[PDB]
């Protein structure tokens, strides 16, 4: 009996959040698209810092999706 393999750790992903109020982000920076925020209110506030991180980045790889309505 010569065996020994183990590495199937299961972990669930976490939803995005704001950077100022860590509140429901469900939004993306309309400048770099590499940040999350609840509303423009915070975006402006935490802009002095984020700014540096924000770098002109055009849209790249897009995912597939399709919402619905009731
Ligand atoms: Zn916020
Ligand atoms: Zn940005």
């Amino acid at each position: 009996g010569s065996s020994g393999s183990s590495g199937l750790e299961a972990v669930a992903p976490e939803r995005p959040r704001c950077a100022y109020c860590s509140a429901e982000a469900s939004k993306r920076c309309s400048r770099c698209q590499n940040e999350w925020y609840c509303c423009r209110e915070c975006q402006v506030k935490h802009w002095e810092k984020h700014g540096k991180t924000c770098v002109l980045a055009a849209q790249g790889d897009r995912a597939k999706s399709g919402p619905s309505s009731g």
Side-chain angles (χ1 to χ4, degrees):
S2 290
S3 205
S5 195
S6 200
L8 52 88
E9 51 179 76
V11 179
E14 286 275 75
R15 288 157 74 85
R17 67 278 282 272
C18 195
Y20 198 117
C21 72
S22 57
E24 277 173 320
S26 295
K27 198 168 153 297
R28 304 170 165 281
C29 172
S30 274
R31 205 88 157 183
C32 65
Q33 305 85 50
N34 207 356
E35 209 76 53
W36 293 96
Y37 293 105
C38 69
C39 270
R40 69 280 211 200
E41 269 178 290
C42 288
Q43 182 190 33
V44 178
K45 280 172 203 84
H46 179 227
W47 176 279
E48 59 182 36
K49 197 153 84 173
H50 168 70
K52 284 207 90 175
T53 310
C54 195
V55 48
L56 268 90
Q59 292 307 97
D61 284 41
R62 267 276 268 155
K64 75 286 211 73
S65 291
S68 63
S69 212

